Every structure is written in structure tokens, then in C-alpha cells.
Design a binder for this molecule. Structure first.
Ligand SMILES: Nc1ncnc2c1ncn2[C@@H]1O[C@H](COP(=O)(O)OP(=O)(O)OC[C@H]2O[C@H](OP(=O)(O)O)[C@H](O)[C@@H]2O)[C@@H](O)[C@H]1O
Ligand SMILES: [K+]
Length: 187
């Protein structure tokens, strides 16, 4: 059984559509693992028990998930209202946001915007930013974001996972540099 497939479904439950799987989240995003298990089994994940859900969280390379006795939440990525307490640590001076080349004109006009999610997501990993952009297209641009530019105008940059940070919005003036990574047809 591929952890990655169960993880993609679990993330959708914990970020976007918990009710579709019989789950109610707390205001801090916490689901009862027992409810997640039942909803998955009803959707055809006939082998899944608490052990497997807990394992998805423990083995996740990014720290997408958090566990405590009986419960699991996503640390970030939500489109439904939750308040997730940040992890300790200060943000680095530069963070990355991966996107597509086609989005650059509107990002330069309106800033990096949260879209359907509660926050803009930034990473300390250039390679992760590239993979994030590649979810949307083959011609990717990575924006280098000046974190002190965000902070000094009152935009808190919160650590959600070891490498993933959230902010309400990134003003275009805080984009320090644009790096391109391209796939597919050579230009
Ligand atoms: N002004 C503007 N005009 C036009 N387009 C604009 C724009 N501002 C931003 N955009 C783009 O609008 C898209 C929104 O798309 P999304 O909501 O999926 O955001 P995202 O791609 O950051 O991804 C979130 C996390 O979700 C995944 O995490 P996981 O692996 O699932 O854990 C990822 O890796 C991340 O961490 C992105 O292309 C933005 O650049
Ligand atoms: K923080």
C-alpha cells in the first residue's frame, strides 16, 4: 500500500472536506483518528486502522500532520477555518514560493495571494518550492521573498512545519528575485 496515496486523501479530509468522510474538526483543526478511520473504510480503504493513519503522520517527510492521543490534524494547507498554533523558531531571512510563469504578472500586481486557502505558503527549501510549482504547470518560477520586508510592515510569518511557513499575503515589493525552472518543450 503506497503511503503517498492514503496521505493525499488524508490531507484532503483534514484541510478541505472533513464532512465528506464523516469527520468534524475542532477549531484548532483536530480530528478524532477513529472518525477518520471509519470514513476512509467506508470509502473503500478496507485495510485501514488507526495504526495506518498514525503511520502516515509519523512517516511524512514534510511534517504535514500532527498527532496527539486519539487525534490528528494537518499543520497547514487548510481551506476551512482553523487556528493552528505555530511551531517554535524564527523564520529565515529569505523564503521561497514556487509558482508558474503564467501567474507572475498578476502576482507582481496584487502580491502572492492565499487563494482558496487561509494563508500563503512559503518554504525554506528551494527544491520543495520547485515541486510545489510543478503541481500547477511545467514552466515554474520560484519567488525569493524578503522575510523582513513582510515582518516590518506587520505581517507575521509563522512556522507550521520544519520547512513550511505561512503568511497572510506577500506584497510584490517583498519579492527580492525570481528564479526559473523549466520542464517539457525546450524554449
Ligand atoms: N496574485 C496571484 N495571481 C495569480 N496566481 C497567484 C497569485 N498569488 C498566488 N497565485 C498562485 O495561485 C496558486 C494557488 O494554489 P494553491 O492554493 O494550491 O497554493 P500553493 O501552490 O502555494 O500550495 C499550497 C501548499 O499546498 C501544497 O502542500 P502539500 O504538498 O499538499 O502538503 C504545496 O506544496 C504548498 O505547501 C499558486 O500557484 C500561487 O502561486
Ligand atoms: K512561528
Amino acid at each position: 500500500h503506497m503511503r503517498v496515496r492514503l496521505s493525499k486523501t488524508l490531507a484532503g479530509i483534514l484541510r478541505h472536506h472533513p464532512g465528506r468522510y464523516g469527520v468534524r474538526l475542532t477549531r484548532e483543526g483536530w480530528a478524532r483518528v477513529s472518525e477518520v478511520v471509519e470514513g476512509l473504510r467506508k470509502a473503500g480503504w478496507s485495510w485501514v486502522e488507526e495504526w495506518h493513519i498514525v503511520g502516515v503522520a509519523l512517516h511524512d517527510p514534510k511534517g504535514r500532520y500532527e498527532l496527539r492521543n486519539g487525534e490528528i490534524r494537518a499543520r497547514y494547507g487548510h481551506s476551512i477555518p482553523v487556528n493552528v498554533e505555530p511551531l517554535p523558531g524564527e523564520p529565515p531571512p529569505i523564503l521561497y514560493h514556487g509558482t508558474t510563469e503564467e501567474a507572475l504578472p498578476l502576482i507582481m500586481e496584487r502580491g502572492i495571494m492565499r487563494g482558496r486557502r487561509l494563508k500563503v505558503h512559503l518554504t525554506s527549501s528551494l527544491e520543495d518550492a520547485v515541486s510545489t510549482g510543478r503541481r500547477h504547470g511545467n514552466l515554474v518560477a520560484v519567488l525569493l521573498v524578503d522575510v523582513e520586508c513582510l515582518r516590518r510592515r506587520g505581517l507575521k510569518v509563522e512556522r507550521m512545519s520544519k520547512t513550511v511557513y505561512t503568511v497572510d499575503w506577500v506584497p510584490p515589493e517583498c519579492i527580492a528575485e525570481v528564479r526559473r525552472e523549466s520542464l517539457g518543450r525546450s524554449l
